[PDB]
């Protein structure tokens, strides 16, 4: 054949390994697996197929217990990756993108939401098209302004409600992974497959205003408002299209 199959060095293959995981989390849109299958066979002694990667993500973020190594393998009590860390997080860096991801710890602390069982559709309602950052009552959005006045944090409490970014350069913080997003569209969130789709329980949008690259940055999302039902009673969460200008 013409195609010389590449043999990846430990560092090169390790970057491609993380590159594949980041695509499965849906944080990235492209992946390079050339030579990744060989790298696993020599360094890991197993085939890094889609099934293998699914268990690594599922174990690292949810079901895994005990010490973990740089390749997301766990141990409950010469060759590489036999030093199992216990720091609680791994820096998943593919070289083209990177995200700091915190290891699962079972029911200890904030959990995740199963969007296969959960699917919250919020009925539309007329509402103000523009919302001032200084007076956000929405139940999905909480805003904090700091004394410097050139930093804004928007805490999203309903990850199920899409937030679309336009002309923004942002840093996302969550109990699952931390990363930066520089592309327009719906905020990307880590999706972990475990007998269904799981996403962060909450995430924080950090907007740095001390630089010029966030000029004209604007958020478009649904403002969830708990209004009372004219009929029957109780509370039926509604929503309305709104825009929050930051820049």
């Amino acid at each position: 054949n013409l195609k010389m199959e590449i043999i990846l060095t430990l560092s090169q293959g390790l970057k491609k390994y993380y590159g594949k995981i980041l695509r499965l989390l849906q944080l990235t849109l492209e992946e390079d697996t050339e030579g990744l299958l060989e790298w696993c066979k020599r360094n890991l002694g197993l085939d890094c197929d889609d099934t293998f990667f699914q268990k690594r993500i599922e174990e690292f973020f949810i079901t895994g217990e005990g010490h973990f190594n740089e390749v997301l393998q766990f141990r409950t009590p010469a060759e590489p990756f036999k030093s199992y860390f216990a720091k609680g997080f791994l820096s998943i860096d593919s070289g083209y993108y990177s995200a700091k991801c915190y290891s699962g710890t079972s029911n200890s602390g904030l959990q995740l939401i199963n969007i296969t069982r959960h699917s919250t559709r919020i009925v539309d309602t007329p509402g103000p098209k523009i919302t001032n950052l200084k007076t956000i009552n929405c139940i999905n959005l909480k805003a904090s302004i700091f004394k410097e006045h050139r930093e804004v944090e928007i805490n999203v409490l309903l990850p199920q409600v899409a937030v679309n970014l336009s002309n923004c350069h942002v840093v996302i913080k969550s109990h699952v992974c931390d990363y930066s997003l520089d592309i327009d569209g719906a905020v990307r969130l880590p999706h972990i497959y475990h007998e269904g789709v799981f996403i962060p329980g909450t995430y924080k949008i950090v907007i740095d205003k001390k630089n010029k690259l966030n000029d004209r940055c604007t958020l478009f999302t649904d403002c969830v408002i708990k209004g009372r039902e004219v009929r029957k009673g109780q509370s039926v969460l509604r929503q309305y299209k709104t825009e929050i200008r930051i820049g």
Partner: antibody
Amino acid sequence: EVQLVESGGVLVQPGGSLRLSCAASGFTVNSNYMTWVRQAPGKGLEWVSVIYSGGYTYYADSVKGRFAISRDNSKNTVYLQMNSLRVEDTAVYYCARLRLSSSWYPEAFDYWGQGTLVTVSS
Amino acid sequence: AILLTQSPSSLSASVGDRVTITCRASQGISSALAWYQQKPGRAPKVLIYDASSLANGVPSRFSGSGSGTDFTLTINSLQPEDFATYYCQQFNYYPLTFGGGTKVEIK
């Protein structure tokens, strides 16, 4: 001292089958990668195949369809087996151990065996 | 396959000469070239295991230098014990392959 001894090479009829072997000593073949290389008389070396510690294998493009490399932990032996020989299969065959750097990159063959000759003609 | 090629095909050299041989690949391999002695009716033997890094037990007369895809092997002094033929390898890609090697001629 670690030594590799190849044996069992013979003349065989073209299209026949043959069972090369390579016994190790001073180490266990399953611990580290074993390779095969061969030379057509008067020509240079060529590579044939490799078997990883995980028992996975890879083969040269000319031979991927025809040769099987195998090993047995208890016989401390690697085997190379021919499904059907071509005339260009005549060569001396050497077994060799493949040594990784500590970064687990393959760097060089060492402890080459004394070689074994196989031939294919009327 | 990755085309590995080497020059000169035969090298005139005499006892105590300092001399060099060249090995090259058709593509940008960067490291993991290996070089072997070969002698008539014998197994080859490694001399160089990665580019410049001399293998253990090799005579210090040999050294390697370059940047992968272009590489050379050099002899500080042609000891007649090393009249042989020298072969080079690459490990940057599968399939593994060897050049045609180089002769040395006593001249």
